Write an enzyme that holds these catalytic residues in place. Structure first.
Site, mmCIF file in Angstrom:
data_model
loop_
_atom_site.group_PDB
_atom_site.id
_atom_site.type_symbol
_atom_site.label_atom_id
_atom_site.label_comp_id
_atom_site.label_asym_id
_atom_site.label_seq_id
_atom_site.Cartn_x
_atom_site.Cartn_y
_atom_site.Cartn_z
ATOM 1 N N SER B 119 -66.505 35.240 -9.725
ATOM 2 C CA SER B 119 -66.352 36.624 -10.129
ATOM 3 C C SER B 119 -67.301 37.643 -9.808
ATOM 4 O O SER B 119 -66.904 38.823 -9.862
ATOM 5 C CB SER B 119 -65.643 36.777 -11.637
ATOM 6 O OG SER B 119 -67.078 36.465 -12.568
ATOM 7 N N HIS B 147 -59.674 32.254 -11.938
ATOM 8 C CA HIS B 147 -59.403 33.653 -11.426
ATOM 9 C C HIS B 147 -58.548 33.530 -10.323
ATOM 10 O O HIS B 147 -58.156 34.482 -9.507
ATOM 11 C CB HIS B 147 -60.797 34.058 -10.850
ATOM 12 C CG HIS B 147 -61.685 34.724 -11.837
ATOM 13 N ND1 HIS B 147 -61.426 35.994 -12.624
ATOM 14 C CD2 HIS B 147 -62.803 34.220 -12.777
ATOM 15 C CE1 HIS B 147 -62.187 36.356 -13.779
ATOM 16 N NE2 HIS B 147 -63.079 35.102 -13.652
ATOM 17 N N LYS B 179 -56.150 34.908 -17.299
ATOM 18 C CA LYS B 179 -56.653 35.954 -16.568
ATOM 19 C C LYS B 179 -55.358 36.498 -15.804
ATOM 20 O O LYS B 179 -55.178 37.873 -15.676
ATOM 21 C CB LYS B 179 -57.279 35.343 -15.326
ATOM 22 C CG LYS B 179 -58.872 35.713 -15.496
ATOM 23 C CD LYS B 179 -59.355 34.695 -16.555
ATOM 24 C CE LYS B 179 -60.851 34.876 -16.421
ATOM 25 N NZ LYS B 179 -61.676 33.803 -17.628
#
Lengths: 51, 187, 187
Positions: B119, B147, B179
């Site tokens: 990230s 993610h 997420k």
């Protein structure tokens, strides 16, 4: 005397050059730790290991 | 809204098993497990099968939960630079040759931990090279992808879809629902 | 006076089996073998079960046949001073700790070679201490007794009779018939 002051500079420069010429070394060294090894020997150890 | 307790005495319902099978089919594996929190999942996963005599090789930019789990496990840790595979191969070779510290006996096992998508950088990991290395040197692979499980891929399967890698090559796959799916938990 | 040939194909008669059974009963073991020559027996015994990865610990005053057999086997050799047991224990402990040369992996096995009675000195070996050490450190024992199989002991059984040691503690017992029984060969 005046040559003493120059000798101090000479002694500093010599130590600087000596430290510059040296090679890096670390406690946590590479394969060269033991080393007592050759490329042919290392493959035998790698292949012999079983998990 | 209330539950019974730990999922070994009371607190398991048919919805739990349905979610288990649905997640297992969606990912492409054979079986799975679902937990209520992701940080706890990572912090408690590692100590079940790792010991003082094992070795863990991990990147330098991993999440905090993996670090806490490895600290609790008690195994040895070696780290490699981000994005370097020559260094990784050299480290693996050296660690295989040297063995345990102060005794130089062979390790019981070796595990590789990585992340699907980072990230802080927004970069991908080179999965095929890791698979090739683990096949050649007989190592194990652990992939963390929270993610990239729902937002990336031609159909959203994950990192294993864009590269075309068969899911059976990786050993353990983990992820969280926070997420992309709008709900809390992990698997 | 003629024999057919190698015992594996032709040349075995009932007299051979009778002699082996009689020797086995006389010594006190369970089974035995008979050979036509003693030097050849020692020179060919060791290579059958020893390898480059094993270790042999032997005295400094052993016979030449044992040295030739160990040379042909190919295993590592370590020697200790005559009559020293503290040094022997220290050597065993050290060799267990260090392991193989240049790789420091553990040995596959360790064998102790000794001789019952030494002709050049006329002295006996301390068998109970060797038995105690091999029981404590899980090592194997080989005893060479050609000068003491028939001439020594309350009834002439050997070195195992004067000390009262049970014959089952020692692994391999060997001897020759030349010295006391008036005929050539070994077992």
């Amino acid at each position: 005397d005046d040559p003493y002051r120059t000798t101090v500079e000479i002694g500093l420069i010599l130590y600087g050059i000596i430290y510059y010429l040296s090679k890096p070394q670390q406690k946590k060294s590479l394969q060269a730790q033991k080393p007592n090894l050759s490329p042919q020997e290392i493959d035998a150890l790698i292949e012999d290991w079983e998990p | 809204i209330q539950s019974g307790g730990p999922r070994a005495q009371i607190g398991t319902t048919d919805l739990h098993i349905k979610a288990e099978k649905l997640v297992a089919r969606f990912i492409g594996k054979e079986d799975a497990l679902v937990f209520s929190m992701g940080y706890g999942t990572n912090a408690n996963l590692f100590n079940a099968f790792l010991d003082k005599k094992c070795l863990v090789i991990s990147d330098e930019l991993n999440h905090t939960s993996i670090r806490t789990g490895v600290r609790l496990s008690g195994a040895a840790v070696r780290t490699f630079k981000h994005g370097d595979m020559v260094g990784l191969e050299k480290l693996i070779r050296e660690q295989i040759v040297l063995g345990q510290p102060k005794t130089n006996r062979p390790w019981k096992k070796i595990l590789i931990c990585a992340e699907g998508l980072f990230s802080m950088e927004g970069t991908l990991c080179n999965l095929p090279k890791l698979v090739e290395l683990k096949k050649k040197y007989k190592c194990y692979l652990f992939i963390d992808e929270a993610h990239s499980i729902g937002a990336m891929g031609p159909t959203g399967r994950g990192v294993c879809e864009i590269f075309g890698v068969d899911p059976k090559d990786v050993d353990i796959l983990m992820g969280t629902f926070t997420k992309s799916f709008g709900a809390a938990g992990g698997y």
